[PDB]
Amino acid sequence: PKGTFKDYVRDRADLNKDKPVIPAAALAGYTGSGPIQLWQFLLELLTDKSCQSFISWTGDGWEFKLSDPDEVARRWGKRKNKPKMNYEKLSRGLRYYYDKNIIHKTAGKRYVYRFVCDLQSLLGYTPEELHAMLDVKP
Amino acid sequence: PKGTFKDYVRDRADLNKDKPVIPAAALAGYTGSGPIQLWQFLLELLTDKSCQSFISWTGDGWEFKLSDPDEVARRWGKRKNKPKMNYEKLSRGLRYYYDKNIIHKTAGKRYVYRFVCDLQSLLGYTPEELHAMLDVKP
Numbered sequence: 541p542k543g544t545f546k547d548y549v550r551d552r553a554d555l556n557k558d559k560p561v562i563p564a565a566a567l568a569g570y571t572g573s574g575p576i577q578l579w580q581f582l583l584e585l586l587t588d589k590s591c592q593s594f595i596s597w598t599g600d601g602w603e604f605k606l607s608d609p610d611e612v613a614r615r616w617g618k619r620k621n622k623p624k625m626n627y628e629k630l631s632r633g634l635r636y637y638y639d640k641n642i643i644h645k646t647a648g649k650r651y652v653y654r655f656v657c658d659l660q661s662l663l664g665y666t667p668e669e670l671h672a673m674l675d676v677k678p
Numbered sequence: 679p680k681g682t683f684k685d686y687v688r689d690r691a692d693l694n695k696d697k698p699v700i701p702a703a704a705l706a707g708y709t710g711s712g713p714i715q716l717w718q719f720l721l722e723l724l725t726d727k728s729c730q731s732f733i734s735w736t737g738d739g740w741e742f743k744l745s746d747p748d749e750v751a752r753r754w755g756k757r758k759n760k761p762k763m764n765y766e767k768l769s770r771g772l773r774y775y776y777d778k779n780i781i782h783k784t785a786g787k788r789y790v791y792r793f794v795c796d797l798q799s800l801l802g803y804t805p806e807e808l809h810a811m812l813d814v815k816p
Contacts, residue, residue: 541708541709541710543802544799544800544801544802545700545704545705545708545800545801545802545803546801546802546803547802548704548707548708549704552704558704562683566683566686566687566690566696567683569686570683570686570687661679661682662679662682662683663682663683663684664681664682664683664684664685665684
């Protein structure tokens, strides 16, 4: 392409990309879920500094917000090779996690959710630790 | 719950896994190649310290050896969700790269090939540079 592959990688690194704390494929392998799942993908985006403009931790425990839900849906589609992925499907996926108690929606607010499963024990990180590593303001 | 995700990751790191100098996905993205191609996959394995037992650089420029061709094929099939992938198909794939001048086979030797496209200009790395980062004996 333009410059060398080395340039490409350096440019991505400079933009804080390709180094999520919790890579979805890695978490899928660890949990043995086979295919990558939406909740694991959201976790990767939330621990990827380059993604903070469209999805981020609110600073309240495991609560997060979708600043650009369409972008989130777009990336999800690309990751699962489903070009037809959209916000309608993304929201349906999120509602599915309600009864599964993986993700709950924050009442009286919009596009704000919270992981309600025990991620601290599963992941080995506290909300504080993760927020420091990602330099989250709140 | 065999440890935490964090332990799972450190365990793999202690085995020199998950850190290829040239990830196939990244290379495909940079070249705008779409799906990951076999030659890109070989480059990934060749720059992944954890794969040296079945595929490695010979120490002569961009020449490499498939010490365990069957395992290489298995990993390729696994990466592309192609369960039928095996040595016969992998070898067919390699031969296809001949007239495409991407990879040529070293005559007179067994399981030895060489990238013949200009990888130095494409990657930004010299063979010797990669060899050093990978502790190639030779």
